[PDB]
Amino acid sequence: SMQEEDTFRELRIFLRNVTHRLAIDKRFRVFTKPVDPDEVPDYVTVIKQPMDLSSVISKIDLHKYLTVKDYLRDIDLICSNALEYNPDRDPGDRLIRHRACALRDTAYAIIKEELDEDFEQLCEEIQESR
Numbered sequence: 001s002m003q004e005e006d007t008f009r010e011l012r013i014f015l016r017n018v019t020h021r022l023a024i025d026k027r028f029r030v031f032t033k034p035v036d037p038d039e040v041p042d043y044v045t046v047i048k049q050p051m052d053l054s055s056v057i058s059k060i061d062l063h064k065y066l067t068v069k070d071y072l073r074d075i076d077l078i079c080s081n082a083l084e085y086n087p088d089r090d091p092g093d094r095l096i097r098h099r100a101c102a103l104r105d106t107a108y109a110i111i112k113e114e115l116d117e118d119f120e121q122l123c124e125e126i127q128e129s130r
């Protein structure tokens with residue numbers, strides 16, 4: 001219905017705003033675009049589902065997220081990919097891992113403060129009806 005389409009449009013607006021606020025944070029620059037294979041050639045072989053904030057924006061615009069839970073799965077993926085690919089004790093690896101956890105924590109904190117639980121519940125119930 002028109003009301004359900006209005007609901008998902010509001011969701012997309014909300015998700016674009018959250019994602020933009022993450023994307024403009026200097027700490028998260030490394031997560032804004034896909035990994036360049038010329039810089040990191042074994043990434044594609046090690047990480048089976050690459051995810052980044054530009055891919056998240058594309059997925060929002062392709063109507064791929066019907067709930068905030070589905071969106072947070074991809075944010076969690078950005079984080080888990082970083083922990084998997086950069087597991088070493090070296091400062092480079094430790095920096096990106098800290099940034100990855102910060103990205104995750106920041107996304108969850110924004111959502112905790114600004115997502116209405118009844119709005120998310122509505123999204124989930126519409127999704128479950130399809």
Ligand SMILES: Cc1cc2ccnc(N[C@@H]3CCNC[C@H]3OCC3CCS(=O)(=O)CC3)c2[nH]c1=O
Pocket residue numbers: 030031035039040081082085086090092093095096099
């Ligand atoms: C998304 C991503 C991008 C990336 C780009 C370059 N190098 C990586 N990993 C290196 C693997 C071996 N040890 C050093 C690591 O690079 C650390 C470096 C810290 C600064 S940063 O801006 O977070 C880019 C990664 C990278 N690992 C990644 O997971």
